[PDB]
């Protein structure tokens, strides 16, 4: 993930211009190799046409170049790229929205599962660990970085996400499909045991716990679905064919013909086809947006930081359910204890942001005394 949110907080002069001076996650980094290949092919064709071809061969090549330049169209490519990239971006954000966060679940586990003794600690930690284990089980299934961190279940054991007993239990239950769903059954059964054992005081709290857990399960299932059901290969091939056919045609139709022939539009022979290179940057970068985002769990610069998410979730959830259980700051009257209309101060840098309340769009409507009188 490349974050530039702070750089575009305000619409300043050349706001998006400055973003052109970035390398990581940039268009240049993504398409420099393709551009080099295209440039080499273009100039190889130029040299062949200029030197190797004879007079009649050169005339044939010139006729071909005019014919090609006539057959270059940018409407269909723009249409297909726009629609396909819109789909890819929508799926990319949907895949982010299905990354599980244990925050709701950990708050419920910390509040509801009672006991400051070693049994209560163990129970809360085990429940939140089951949540985290399901999450990383799915993430290592779908993310190459997480997989490289945990290439086997024994790596999960060594990293503390799973205990040896849990690993043995998983081995016992082995089915010929992904076992990422098992920690949810474990969580449900352990929560039921906690309720029956008196650690959870009321069944409605148990229902809340299991509802949050099931929300996490639905998110992980959506992650699995996105990993499994790719965008149809035919659509991807169609957009790829459109782009690459356009630029294969450009390789010939954008050659600088010999000026002496004085063909229409070829009067001046510049060596560098600047507009064709700009079109390459535009269209191939538009395609590279999809190429990077189509699988957001790879290792691109703009792909999600799954390993950081795993680490943060583990730390935060364990802290929330273990150290923060029934550990509250002292409850004392606040600064506005007897202030009916609290007005927190503003700093010098923020005083300009003090605003009057918006009362509605009808507030300033003006009516006469006659207009405002109720009729019978």
Ligand X SMILES: CCCCCCCCCCCCCC(=O)OC[C@H](COP(=O)([O-])OCC[N+](C)(C)C)OC(=O)CCCCCCCCCCCCC
Q: Which of residues 280-299 bind its own copies (CB under 8 A)?
A: 281-283, 285-289, 291-295, 297-299
Q: Where are the alpha helices (DSSP H) in 229-266?
A: 233-253
Q: Please identify which residue in 4, 41, 44, 261 interacts with its own copies, judged by CB under 8 A.
A: 4
Q: Are 302 and 27 in contact (CB under 8 A)?
A: no
Give the SS3 label for residue 187.
helix
248 is a site residue for ligand X (CB under 6 A): yes
Q: Please identify which residue in 38, 42, 49, 184 interacts with its own copies, judged by CB under 8 A.
A: 184
Cα–Cα distance for residue pair 60/160, rounded to 1 Å: 71
57 is a site residue for its own copies (CB under 8 A): no
184 is a site residue for ligand X (CB under 6 A): no
Cα–Cα distance for residue pair 81/283, rounded to 1 Å: 8
Cα–Cα distance for residue pair 166/170, rounded to 1 Å: 6
303 annotated ligand-binding residue: yes
22 is a site residue for ligand X (CB under 6 A): no
CA distances from 45 to 243, 253, 276 (A): 20, 11, 15
351 annotated ligand-binding residue: no
18 is a site residue for ligand X (CB under 6 A): yes
CB of 225 to Ca ion, least distance (A): 17
246 is a site residue for ligand X (CB under 6 A): no
Q: How many chain residues bind ligand X (CB under 6 A)? A: 16
295 is a site residue for Ca ion (CB under 5 A): yes
295 annotated ligand-binding residue: yes
CB neighbours of 3 closer than 8 A, spacing ≥ 6? none
Burial of 16 (0-12, 13-18, 19+ CB in 10 A): exposed
338 annotated ligand-binding residue: no
Cα–Cα distance for residue pair 74/275, rounded to 1 Å: 13
Pick the closer one to its own copies by CB: 51 or 270: 270
Q: Are 215 and 104 in contact (CB under 8 A)?
A: yes
Token pair, residue 119, equals 């049994």
Give the SS3 label for residue 102.
coil
Select from ligand X, Ca ion, its own copies, none the partner in contact with residue 41, using the beta carbon and a kind-dependent cut-off of 5 to 8 Å. Answer: ligand X
Select from ligand X, Ca ion, its own copies, none the partner in contact with residue 47, using the beta carbon and a kind-dependent cut-off of 5 to 8 Å. Answer: none
Indicate the annotated binding residues for Ca(2+): 9, 292, 295, 300, 303
Q: State the residues that interact with ligand X by CB under 6 A.
A: 13-14, 17-18, 20-21, 34, 37-38, 41, 241, 244-245, 247-248, 251
């Amino acid at each position: 993930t490349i974050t530039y949110t702070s750089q575009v907080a305000n619409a300043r002069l050349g706001s998006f211009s400055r973003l052109l001076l970035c390398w990581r996650g940039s268009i240049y980094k993504l398409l420099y190799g393709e551009f080099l290949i295209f440039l080499l092919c273009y100039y190889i064709i130029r040299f062949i046409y200029r030197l190797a071809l004879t007079e009649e061969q050169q005339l044939m090549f010139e006729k071909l170049t005019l014919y090609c330049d006539s057959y270059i169209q940018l409407i269909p490519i723009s249409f297909v790229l726009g629609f396909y990239v819109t789909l890819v971006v929508t799926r990319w954000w949907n895949q982010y929205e299905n990354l599980p966060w244990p925050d709701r679940l950990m708050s419920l586990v910390s509040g509801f599962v009672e006991g400051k003794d070693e049994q209560g600690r163990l129970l809360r930690r085990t429940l939140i660990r089951y949540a985290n284990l399901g999450n990383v089980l799915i993430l290592r299934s779908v993310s190459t970085a997480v997989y490289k961190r945990f290439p086997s279940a024994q790596h999960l054991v060594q990293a503390g996400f799973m205990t040896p007993a849990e690993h043995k239990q998983l081995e016992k239950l082995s089915l010929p499909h992904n076992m990422f769903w098992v920690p949810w059954v474990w969580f449900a059964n352990l929560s039921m045991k906690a309720w029956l054992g008196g650690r959870i005081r009321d069944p409605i709290l148990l229902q809340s716990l299991l509802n949050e857990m099931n929300t996490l399960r639905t998110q992980c299932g959506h992650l699995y679905a996105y990993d499994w059901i790719s965008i149809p290969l035919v659509y991807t091939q169609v957009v790829t064919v459109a782009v690459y056919s356009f630029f294969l045609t450009c390789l010939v139709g954008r050659q600088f013909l010999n000026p002496a022939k004085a063909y229409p539009g070829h009067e001046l022979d510049l060596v560098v086809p600047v507009f064709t290179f700009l079109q390459f940057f535009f269209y191939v970068g538009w395609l590279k947006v999809a190429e990077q985002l189509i699988n957001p769990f790879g290792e691109d610069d703009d792909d999600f930081e799954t390993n950081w998410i795993v680490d943060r979730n583990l730390q935060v959830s364990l802290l929330a359910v273990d150290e923060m259980h029934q550990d509250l700051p002292r409850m004392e009257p606040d600064m506005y204890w007897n202030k009916p209309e609290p007005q927190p101060p503003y700093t010098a840098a923020s005083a300009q942001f003090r605003r009057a309340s918006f009362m509605g769009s009808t507030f300033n409507i003006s009516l006469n005394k006659e207009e405002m009188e109720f009729q019978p």
